[PDB]
Amino acid sequence: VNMFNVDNSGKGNCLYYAYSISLMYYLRAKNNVKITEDIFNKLGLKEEDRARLRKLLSKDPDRAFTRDEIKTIIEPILGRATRDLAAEHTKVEFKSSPHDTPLFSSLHYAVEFGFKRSLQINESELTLLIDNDFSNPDYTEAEIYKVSGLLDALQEYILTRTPSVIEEFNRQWENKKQELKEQSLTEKEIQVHQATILDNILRKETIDFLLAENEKHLDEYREHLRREFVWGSEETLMVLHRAIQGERMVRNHEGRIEPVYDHEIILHVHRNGASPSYQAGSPEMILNNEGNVHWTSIIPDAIFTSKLTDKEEKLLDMLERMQSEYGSKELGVEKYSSISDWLSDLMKQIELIKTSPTAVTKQKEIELFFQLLAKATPKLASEPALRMSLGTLFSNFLECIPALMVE
Amino acid sequence: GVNMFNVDNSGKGNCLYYAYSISLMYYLRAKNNVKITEDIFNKLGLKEEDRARLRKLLSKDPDRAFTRDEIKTIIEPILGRATRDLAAEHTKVEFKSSPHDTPLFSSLHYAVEFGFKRSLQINESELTLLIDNDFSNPDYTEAEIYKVSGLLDALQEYILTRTPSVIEEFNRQWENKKQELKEQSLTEKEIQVHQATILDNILRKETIDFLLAENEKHLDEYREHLRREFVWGSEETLMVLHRAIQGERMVRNHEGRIEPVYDHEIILHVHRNGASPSYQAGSPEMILNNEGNVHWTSIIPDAIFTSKLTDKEEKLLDMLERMQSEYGSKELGVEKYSSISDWLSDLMKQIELIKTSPTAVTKQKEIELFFQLLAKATPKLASEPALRMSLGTLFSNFLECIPALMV
Amino acid sequence: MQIFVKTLTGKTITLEVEPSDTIENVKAKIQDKEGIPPDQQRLIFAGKQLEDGRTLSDYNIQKESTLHLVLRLRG
Amino acid sequence: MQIFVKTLTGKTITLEVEPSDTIENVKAKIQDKEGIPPDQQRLIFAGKQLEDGRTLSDYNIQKESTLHLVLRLRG
């Protein structure tokens, strides 16, 4: 049950490495070439990078990506591309509609708290209309508060703008009082009307702070998210997935807003290996968080399944590369003229071990395998590099013996 | 009204150290002891010119609070950096004295034990079972060490590197302990406790070795992180700092028992959002108040300071001093007074002459002279909107302390 | 009236609500589009402490506002 | 055996304990010298979750170890 798991090198780039690996497995399963190129367009990939990734997506869908393929092509190309896209679409969403943004909803908590404190230092009774002691962790652990110096700048901004807030509040309540001339307001009712007016002023204050001096602080958040090795949080993993799918909120014939996608991809988030307790979809991408310090990739069974262990994949990939490096050489032994025909026969013999039914039959395929290794030994140790290749090949084999012995 | 005197600071990121220094300067003036004052100055490494400025501030009438200008131009520039330096440096001093006793070690080891659990399992070692740790305890994860940029990245590469040697070191020591318990028949329960202890002790040295390795690279990173301008101070470093300021030393005895020894004992308390602790401790000499995990301020105990101005009087002085730095340099060509600051200086002296004047008849004539000082500057200070309003606000403040001034 | 919420699945869903709906009913509707039980939802909007028993109109939440589900996970 | 703990008052105190003493007993001893009631003590040592019901010897807390009271306050 969605139990593959694939790690990454992450030196702080884990979210984006893990997203990239999860995505490339998805893109290969969804064999569609217009999905693949559309995602590449969103990521702004240049053509030589697209060529390298397309060659990886051509790989046999029943064989996993190797550790070297992940470390040398997938993480260097897509790690930066997804990080860039997530930081940039964070700003895009804010410019599109600032109030709908996680940045606004999370930073506004500090803004309201600060205005409570600043209003009280300024001896204004508006400080009473706010309840906020800046203790709610649902807000305080957002990424915006981990930006260096941001709360310092937010405090001098709020101290700057408090008197204008007081005057603007008075303006709108004078207008609201005269709009409610003919109604008889209880003092609790007047307090709800006032708290609402102050609320709306403060909401614009949060957005204006981010936008001030041509979007200085908004840009600081983008550049923070974009800095190499900065730890990704799930807020921006989520911005990133909205961007990759091409999600747009669009108004329709009746005037109702509904989400529109270019390419829908079902994403789930797991914690410490555990799937959610509740029933959602059959996911196409799964990202796994480990103890709030690391991110990894869980590959759904419907999206790829190989019947080799990661050690078994390592052994067979190494044999295929031995077959490409030495295969043309001569191996004057028996029927085998090539070393490549010998290596192919090694590959088939290892699979015959894997599929052999019981321990007694596995033992005889193991015996035939050692005799295959024996047949080539006279000629294969009078070659320098290939004797070294035989040794590592053998140790790789020993590493998959626990897996091979299961049948 | 047990302790309601609050004194703020300008803190941009330096609230802690500003607040500590203000709290300390009020203490040193209250304890008019010249060798307590000079020993703390020596601990802070102050040069003689800075000691001179601070000693002149300690000369101030003990019944008058320090003004914002004294605080902003004398106390925080000198003592803010000095206390920050001492707090960062004594953190390393304590670590070099006895690393296991330090808050740095006790807090960072949590991540070290967690990481070694994960790496041991990546290495398919059963030692991963001897650890219970999911890095979820906020008592540890909120330590300052985890806010140092990249430290956990570096810790992750150290742990993954050092895991095989840890496994081999465990095996040697467990072999030795089995041969030491040859003659006993240990259950599965006892053997697991023995193994956990051996691994525990090895991992503890791993934490110290990480900090000490490569000429104390990571230990120095923590010291300079704490020392960087505007970095938010945590209460861990407040306590390190107060240990340093008091000259606390843990010293061993004739009988061999350790007891704390101080140069100068000072009772420090920490308040949260203005509220004293629910429980009864001492009557404190310094109080540091934390506000919503974003600001630090200074509460002055009544036993240390008492102002004998009514607050109507204190507001009038503060407003005059704040006229003096905002407008003081502007020209006011009126008789002696060239600057507006020359005029404000004489206004301040005239209010003190009113207060100390002996009877109501003599007070009335000092009040009359105060009005003639206002008369001399009114033409030119009503020749400007902002200064006209300040002259008006000054006049209203003065009228409100007339009942206090007439006593 | 419509309101929006960003999911834990990299998408945005829409809810039909009234200003008088309690936060509890909003969470029930979220449970009815996502899978999350209400007591597992960490619901966020404009720094407000959305108490289960108080209402959208108590929090000055107007039409087409966007709330956010958070896990506050890092790595 | 002696044990040490860093206070919330910028000092260090010492306790006399035995390896069999529980964390609960240590917290009561801390209440004796400081003022903190046990349920307000956030006590930490070498990454160990000091559960009230387990003992110093359970956590391999040896002679002259230093524990720490924390408030985790910032500014």
Numbering used by the authors:
A (entry chain A): 11 to 417
B (entry chain B): 10 to 416
C (entry chain C), D (entry chain D): 1 to 75
Sentences copied from the publication:
Driven by the hypothesis that additional DUBs may contribute to the modulation of the ubiquitin network by L. pneumophila, we performed bioinformatic analyses of Dot/Icm substrates to identify proteins of potential DUB activity. This exercise led to the identification of Lem27 (Lpg2529) which harbors a motif distantly similar to members of the OTU superfamily of DUBs. Our results demonstrate that Lem27 displays a broader activity toward ubiquitin chain types with a distinct preference for K6-, K11- and K48-type polyubiquitin chains. Structural analysis reveals that Lem27 harbors an OTU1 fold and that it recognizes ubiquitin via interactions mediated by at least six contact sites. We also provide evidence to show that Lem27 coordinates with the SidC family E3 ligases to regulate protein ubiquitination on the surface of bacterial phagosomes.
Upon subjecting the complex formed by selenomethionine-labeled Lem271-417 and Ub-PA to crystallization screening, we obtained crystals and solved the structure to a resolution of 2.43 Å by single-wavelength anomalous diffraction (SAD) phasing. There are two copies of the Lem271-417-Ub-PA complex in an asymmetric unit (ASU). The two DUB modules of Lem271-417 molecules in an ASU are almost identical with a root-mean-square deviation (RMSD) of 0.249 Å over Cα atoms of 407 residues (residues 1–417), except that there is an approximate 35o rotation of a domain consisting of a bundle of four α-helices (α-bundles) formed by α13-α16 spanning residues 315–417. The Lem271-417 molecule is composed of two distinct domains: a DUB domain spanning the first ~300 amino acids (residues 1–314) and a separate domain consisting of the four α-bundles (residues 315–417). The DUB module with a bilobal architecture assumes the shape of the right hand with one of the lobes giving the appearance of the thumb and forefinger and the other lobe as palm plus the three other fingers. The ubiquitin moiety is being held tightly by the open hand with its carboxyl end being inserted into the catalytic cleft to access the side chain of Cys24. A vinylthioether bond is installed between the side chain of Cys24 from Lem271-417 and the propargylamide reactive end of Ub-PA. In the structure, His304 is found within 3.8 Å of the S-atom of the catalytic Cys which most likely would constitute the key Cys-His catalytic dyad for Lem27. Interestingly, when compared with these OTU-domain containing structures, the finger lobe of Lem271-417 (residues 108–221) appears as an insertion domain (residues 108–221), absent in structures of OTU DUBs of eukaryotic origin. Inspection of the Lem271-417-Ub-PA complex reveals that the DUB domain makes extensive contacts with the distal ubiquitin moiety in the S1 site of Lem27 by multiple pairs of hydrogen bonds with a total buried conserved surface area of approximately 1900 Å2.
